[PDB]
Each structure stands twice: as C-alpha cells, then as structure tokens.
Amino acid sequence: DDEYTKLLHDGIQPVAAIDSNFASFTYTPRSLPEDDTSMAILSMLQDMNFINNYKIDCPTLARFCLMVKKGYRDPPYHNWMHAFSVSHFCYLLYKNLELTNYLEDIEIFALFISCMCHDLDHRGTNNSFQVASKSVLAALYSSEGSVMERHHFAQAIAILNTHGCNIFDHFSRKDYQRMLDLMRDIILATDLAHHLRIFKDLQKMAEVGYDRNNKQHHRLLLCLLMTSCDLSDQTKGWKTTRKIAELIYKEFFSQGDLEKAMGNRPMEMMDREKAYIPELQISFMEHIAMPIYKLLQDLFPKAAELYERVASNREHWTKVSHKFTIRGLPSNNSLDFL
C-alpha cells in the first residue's frame, strides 16, 4: 500500500529518465532494479499514449500494475522480471517498428497488457508436468490444452475482476469484449506448441505480404509479436544469453528432479544427468528462435539486428562448447568427482 501511494501521488517519471538507452534494442531491461519496474511500466504506458488515449484511471492503473507484479512467484526464470522484460520488448517494437501501420491501437494496447500478464502465477513447471502430476490446473484445463496459458489468462481476468483494478471498466461493452478476446488470443499464443502449429501460416503471410485489411493477418501478426517478446532475451548480448540459460535450466532441472521422484523419465532437456546445455541451446536457437526473428525481419526490415543477435548468440554457444569438456585436472587437482 505504500508502494501504491507513491506510484499514484508522485507523478509518472519521464520514460527517458529511466536510462539513455531505454528505447533501444540494445538495452537489457533486466538491468533495471526490480523496485523501479512498476513505475517503468507506467512510464511506457504513458509514452505509448495509452493512459490518455483510453482514459485509464490513475488509481486503478497503479493498483493493477502492483497486482500483476504481486501475481508472479519467484521460480528462477518465470518471475516478474521475465514479465517486465517481455513487456519492455513490446515497448521496443512499438518505438522502433511503426506497428501503427500494421495493427489497431487497441491491438497494440492488448499486446502490451498481455505481455505484463502472460505468465501470471507460473509455478516453474510446464504443461506436460501439470498433466503428469494431476495438478488442479490440469483438472481445470487439460481437456483444452495450453494448461498454464489458460491459467495465466484466467489469473489476468481475476485481477481485472478485483475491485479497484479493472483498468477497462469504463470501456463500451463491445470494446471491453474485444480487449478480453485479444488478451485470450495473445496469451494463449505464448504456448510454443501453438506457435509451431501456426508457423506455416506465418511463413505464408510473410511470403504473400501482410494485408492490413485481412483480420486473420492481424491475428497471426499479434501471435508472432507476442512470441518475439517472450523470447527476446535471446536478442541481447552474450552475457544476457548465458545468464538466461542458467535460469531456464535451473528451472527445467528442478522440474526433472520432481518428475524422477514420481517415477517418470524426464525429457533430456529436463534431466540434469543427461542435458548437454550447448547442444540444447543451439537446437532451441536454430529450430525456434532464429526462424521467429527471421520472419520478424521479413515483415519489418528494421528488425534485422534482432535476427543477427540471435544468430551471433547461437555461434557463441558453438565457440564455448569445448569448455564443457574437462581438460587436464579439475581446479582442485582432484579426480574425487569420479
């Protein structure tokens, strides 16, 4: 409540005061201290003109931002700093790519709020684990698929439906229904099985050319953009790539350990006794990340540097892999580890 009081009564800090490089593809939002991130979200919403444009109520918006923040747990990767960094990449796409030539204002606003909300209440395990472990979330949503994503979305809606937090409640019935439908489509798009299912449709869009009058093209493009935000850690420097891999694998291997403990054999990527990080990272980059940024470049020539960073981070894993083989003796001069 004291954070609220300051967020409401102090004023929204100019977005340029956050960092000289804040609106650049090269800025690493993970550099921002966590206690500074809710005010940075208000600064970005202001700079995108959404607060004025949609006449969002200030007290309601401050409550909503804090509630969203408080709705993340602290697994190594799927925490509020990941949501905050995804949301920042949305802001980057807006500042560096002329989205307004492709998407409706309301679409762009929904993509940004969906980025804030898209992993709410994640417990550091994936859809497969929900099913295998017979979790309450699979009881609710296993028949439809995308279990966690449905739960993120439901969590977002629960926040809006909390007294004092409905940032859309003055909207017309038509616009409110549109915003919530968009949030559903965008947050369900973050299931990488969904991205893989629509991949051919994305390629076909890129090849024939984006048609702004085509409602299906809008929908495909929001999916690609949301994916591109959710994987944007791979578009920074090598120090970020390396640190994100440490967090992702800590989280995956915790899951693998639970799976072992219930008698299931984990995916190789989830088993700490089998996973070979360089090879796993290179596969993720070649098979998932680079094709996404290449499609982004195809649609938006000014996105080319993102695809180039991902390709360079990929080359970097090949360059360091040799270090994963123990040459000589360990530092302690001991083979006790054997």
Ligand SMILES: CC(C)Cn1c(=O)n(C)c(=O)c2nc[nH]c21
């Ligand atoms: C978090 C996970 C579902 C997807 N994912 C990811 O987003 N990044 C950035 C990776 O490097 C990665 N490696 C495997 N999965 C990965």
Ligand SMILES: [Mg+2]
């Ligand atoms: Mg997710």
Ligand SMILES: [Zn+2]
């Ligand atoms: Zn995410």
